[PDB]
Structure 1
Amino acid sequence: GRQFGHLTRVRHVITYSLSPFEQRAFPHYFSKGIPNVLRRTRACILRVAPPFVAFYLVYTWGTQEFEKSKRKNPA
């Protein structure tokens, strides 16, 4: 279902738009663009990054213990 004209009630909202043939597809692409990705990165590192390094560490340690274990000195 769904349709358009039966979704919900909206009042007093104007929407100015401009035709795609009158504007640029990539406005300040590098100018405003890159700052935004850095800002999006800041916003999320502390939530995405840590779990992963914990694995990165568990992975390298895990490998070292295993390979070092199949060796032996006395007895």
Structure 2
Amino acid sequence: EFGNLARIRHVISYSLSPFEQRAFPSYFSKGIPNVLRRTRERILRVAPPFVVVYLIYTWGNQEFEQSKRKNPAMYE
């Protein structure tokens, strides 16, 4: 429990009371930049698998259709 969790030394920690500080300091001021900062550090790891899922899904659909489409040469 608390008190026996870990041993740190000389780490001072300042803080403020909730009612004394603005609730949403610069929320959209820096929030947007940060969210954008975040997206650019993770987009290349996340997005291209889902991009090729979209290509495979479309491909499958279209291929399936062509598969279903009657063979004109057949039956003639």
For Structure 1 versus Structure 2, the TM-score category normalised by the shorter chain is: over 0.9
SS at match of 1:35: helix
Superposed CA RMSD in Å reads: 0.7
Counterparts of 1:70 and 1:58, CA distance in 2: 18
Whichever structure has more helix as a proportion of its residues is 2
Q: Where in structure 2 are the equivalents of 1:1-75 lying within 5 Å?
A: 3-71=1-69, 72-75=71-74
The runs of 4+ residues in structure 1 deviating greater than 3 Å are: none
Question: Aligned partners of 2:63, 2:32: CA distance in 1, in Å?
Answer: 42
Give aligned-pair identity as a percent. 77
User: C-alpha distance in 2, partners of 1:59/1:15?
Assistant: 52
Distance 1:73 1:25 in 2: 69
SS at 1:14 equivalent = strand
**Runs of 5+ consecutive residues of structure 1 not aligned to the other structure:** none
String of CA shifts for 1:17-66, please: whole Å, max 9, x gaps: 00001001210011111000011000000000011101010000110000
Q: 5+ unaligned residues in a row in structure 2: which ranges?
A: none
DSSP 3-state at the match of 1:57: helix
Query: Matched residue pairs, number?
Result: 73
